Design a protein around this ligand. Structure first.
Ligand SMILES: [Co+2]
Ligand SMILES: [Co+2]
Ligand SMILES: [Co+2]
Length: 272
């Protein structure tokens, strides 16, 4: 695996090297003081430490929210940049939906509320146009799992119409569309604009042609909400504040390292 020799064993115990899963290729360590598991992602020093990686780390550091994987620290290794972060031990939302087939409206609402909380928070930090696919929606190891968005660049239905049609677009409004796809898949157990023919799906996305199968019963209020997200015109698509006052959303709803140090470490990591 593309990882350096174990390091900083004075502060971390080595647990396991992961070749696939939740965090892709990653090393699991345990913080010696707090006893919490952390995930470590590694990037080779030099050219691979590019401006987008730098930007992503800095933005990751700024994002402090219970539904976004928490940045812990960066460490310089002789061969790699180490990016340490909160570990989420419950897999990803894709796997949970797959195992369940589909969610009840209560379970969909439980995760949707958390997703919207994370997304709304990113928007307030002027971070948007994110990759909010099911695979980047991680879960912690709680019985009622806490959702943990992890979209950071450390390695079809989701694409809104305007992203295909326009060169530039409103990233926050596009994110709302993505949130709708996640809601839909949780409720239905399949993607809204689909068998495997990309062209057909893109055509369906562009003309906003989806249908909730009769096979499953969804409340009319839930149908109305989805219909307000799957709107091709970004100007009239429902906003997150409007989602949060929608009848479906409200029903049975649960209650709602120094920067200079990081810059020096990242900067030095550019030297291979
Ligand atoms: Co975000
Ligand atoms: Co933005
Ligand atoms: Co991630």
């Amino acid at each position: 695996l593309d990882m350096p020799i174990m390091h900083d064993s004075d502060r971390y115990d080595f647990v396991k090297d992961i070749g696939s899963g939740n965090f892709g290729v990653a090393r699991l360590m345990r913080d010696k003081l707090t006893k919490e598991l952390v995930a470590v992602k590694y990037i080779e020093r030099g050219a691979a430490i590019d401006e987008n990686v730098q930007r992503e780390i800095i933005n990751h550091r700024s994002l402090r929210h219970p539904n976004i994987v928490r940045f812990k620290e960066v460490i310089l290794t002789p061969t790699h940049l180490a990016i340490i972060m909160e570990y989420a031990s419950g897999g990803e939302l894709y796997e949970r939906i797959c195992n369940a087939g589909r969610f009840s409206e209560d379970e969909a609402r439980f995760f949707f509320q958390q997703l919207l909380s994370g997304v709304s928070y990113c928007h307030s930090m002027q971070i948007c146009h994110r990759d909010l696919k099911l695979e980047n929606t991680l879960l912690d190891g709680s019985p009622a799992p806490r959702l943990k968005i992890c979209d950071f660049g450390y390695s079809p239905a989701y694409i809104a119409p305007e992203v295909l049609l326009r060169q530039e677009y409103d990233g926050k409004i596009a994110d709302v569309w993505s949130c709708g796809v996640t809601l839909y898949v949780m409720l239905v157990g399949a993607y809204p604009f689909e068998p495997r023919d990309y062209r057909k799906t893109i055509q369906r996305i562009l003309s906003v042609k989806y249908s909730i199968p009769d096979d499953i019963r969804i409340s009319p209020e839930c149908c109305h909400l989805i219909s307000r997200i799957f709107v091709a015109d970004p100007a009239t698509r429902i906003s997150i504040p409007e989602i949060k006052t929608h009848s479906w959303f409200l029903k049975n709803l649960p209650a709602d390292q120094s920067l200079d140090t990081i810059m020096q470490i990242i900067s030095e990591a550019t030297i291979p």
